[PDB]
Scaffold this active site. Structure first.
Site, PDB file in Angstrom:
ATOM      1  CE  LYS B 154      -2.088   0.953   3.784  1.00 20.78           C
ATOM      2  NZ  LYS B 154      -1.225   2.124   4.088  1.00 20.78           N
ATOM      3  CD  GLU B 180       0.548   8.112   9.087  1.00 16.52           C
ATOM      4  OE1 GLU B 180       0.900   9.264   8.758  1.00 16.52           O
ATOM      5  OE2 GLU B 180       0.764   7.106   8.379  1.00 16.52           O
ATOM      6  NE  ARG B 181      -1.286   2.800  15.616  1.00 12.07           N
ATOM      7  CZ  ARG B 181      -2.331   2.577  14.833  1.00 12.07           C
ATOM      8  NH1 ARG B 181      -2.319   2.912  13.554  1.00 12.07           N
ATOM      9  NH2 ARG B 181      -3.415   2.006  15.345  1.00 12.07           N
TER      10      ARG B 181
END
Lengths: 191, 207, 90
Positions: B154, B180-181
């Site tokens: 991805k 986001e992490r």
């Protein structure tokens, strides 16, 4: 804390707190009657011109303009330092919008302080001559010594006859209209 | 144009102004924060005070602290200089690569294009991926959902989309890691460095 | 002397016809609360200073809640809102 007659009335709310603080300040000094009469004059001036009340109760305007207007209208009344400090405290905390309440709360004091108890007498028709004075004589014996009667008279033909008397502690409905109403209600519910 | 902090409740700061009230979505900078704290005006509370949401931490703030109104929304740096860089919400570089020296700043709240500015033809954005260009074509201006989990390329597909659009069409790309992490963001940034889309000191960045 | 003083006090503040005009107390998210508009009707269209339109939905004792027919970025707190005098029509 505050030295006073230790709440001659039972007045509540934040406006009651302000009124009791003003009463304590004006009874520690000998300025109670002066601050009572200039608050009465201030309330009369506010009720005379509603534009002043709308100016005070406007959140758009700054508080400096409000306290300048308050001082300007207290200069012409020849006020004392205590009511000026009281109004400055009211406009400092943005609580001058309830300035009608505290004065009314201050009007609730000096009734028990002066012994004045509020009495309301309602009649079917207004009466005089043989009335009034005997009512005052009858109401004079209803008090312990050191207290006075402040009487308000009302008229209402819907009570048919009799009298509706209310004091600050108790109520009596010894009137002809209510008497015949409950008698007819008793006759309908029983016979 | 200068106000004072009235209340601090979580990330919500109520600030009171004296002369000019800032409009909605304007940015106000706190003058005592060394990592500068930008507050966005969410609503007017009346009484010349406004309620703002904070873009950074709130520990250590004191009541009455001076806030300077910028007279504009959050203006972030824009241009070719922001390619290959990492920015936070307020435009500060957080990739330790130095300052973002640009000449163009733009507010993050703008208007949508009008009814006469839109093309009536629903053109497709050809991306050079045969399965994408044949079975599930990408429309210009459309909303595209890219699915995929762990072990599938991805990230490689995203970078291939960036590279193919920058090559075939000449248009750049913008990645926005909304909540986001940090580990996933670090992996994405290093993969973008390794695959050559983000290039250091060559100014050939595409995202 | 007192009446001239209260006239000066009133004249220290600007003159506003609050029956047909209002000042925005707070503008945001397409909904503006205004001080004034004493003769406004329910569902009545209003005009702002920037040329936008609004509809008076909430008739509260203190303010009037107006839903704005457009973006609220063109309306500042303290702007002038005036009644169109008619309910919303097309």
């Amino acid at each position: 804390a505050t030295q006073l007659v230790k709440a001659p009335i039972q007045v509540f709310g934040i406006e009651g707190r302000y009124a009791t603080a003003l009463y304590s300040a004006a009874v520690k000094q000998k300025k109670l009657e002066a601050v009572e009469k200039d608050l009465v004059q201030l309330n009369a001036s506010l009720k005379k011109f509603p534009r002043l009340g709308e100016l005070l109760k406007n959140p758009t305007l700054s508080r400096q303009l409000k306290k300048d207007a308050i001082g300007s209208m207290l200069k012409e009344q020849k006020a004392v330092d205590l009511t000026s400090n009281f109004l400055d405290l009211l406009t400092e905390n943005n609580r001058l919008k309830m300035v009608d309440g505290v004065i009314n709360a201050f009007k609730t004091i000096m009734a028990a302080h002066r012994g004045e108890v509020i009495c309301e007498v309602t009649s079917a028709k207004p009466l005089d001559e043989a009335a009034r004075k005997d009512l005052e004589v009858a109401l004079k014996g209803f008090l312990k010594p050191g207290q006075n009667i402040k009487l308000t008279l009302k008229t209402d033909p819907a009570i048919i006859g009799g009298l509706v008397v209310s004091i600050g502690d108790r109520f009596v409905d010894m009137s002809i209209g209510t008497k015949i109403k409950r008698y007819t209600a008793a006759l309908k519910t029983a016979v | 144009s200068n106000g004072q902090i009235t209340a601090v409740i979580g990330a919500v700061v109520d600030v009171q102004f004296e002369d000019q009230l800032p409009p909605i979505l304007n940015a106000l900078e706190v003058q005592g924060r060394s990592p500068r704290l930008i507050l966005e005006v969410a609503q007017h509370l009346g009484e010349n005070t406004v309620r703002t949401i904070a873009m950074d931490g709130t520990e250590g703030l004191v009541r009455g602290q001076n806030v300077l109104d910028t007279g504009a929304p959050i203006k972030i740096p824009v241009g070719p200089e922001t390619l290959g860089r990492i920015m936070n919400v307020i435009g500060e570089p957080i990739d330790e690569r130095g300052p973002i020296v640009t000449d163009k700043f733009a507010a993050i709240h703008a208007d949508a294009p009008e009814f006469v500015e839109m093309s009536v033809q629903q053109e497709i954005l050809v991306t050079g991926i045969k399965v994408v260009d044949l079975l599930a074509p990408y429309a210009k201006g459309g909303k595209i959902g890219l699915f995929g989990g762990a072990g599938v390329g991805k990230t490689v597909l995203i970078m291939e989309l960036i590279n193919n659009v920058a090559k075939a069409h000449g248009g750049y790309s913008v990645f926005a890691g909304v909540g986001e992490r940090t580990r996933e963001g670090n992996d994405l940034y290093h993969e973008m460095i390794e695959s050559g889309v983000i290039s250091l000191k060559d100014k050939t960045s595409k995202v | 002397i007192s009446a001239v003083l209260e006239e000066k006090i009133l004249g220290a503040a600007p003159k506003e016809n609050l029956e047909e005009t209002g000042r925005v107390l707070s503008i945001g998210d397409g909904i503006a609360r205004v001080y004034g508009l004493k003769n406004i009707q329910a569902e009545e269209m209003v005009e702002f200073s920037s040329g936008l339109k609004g509809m008076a939905l909430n008739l509260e004792p203190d303010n009037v809640g107006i839903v704005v027919f457009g973006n609220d970025k063109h309306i500042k707190e303290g702007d002038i809102v005036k009644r169109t005098g008619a309910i919303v029509d097309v």
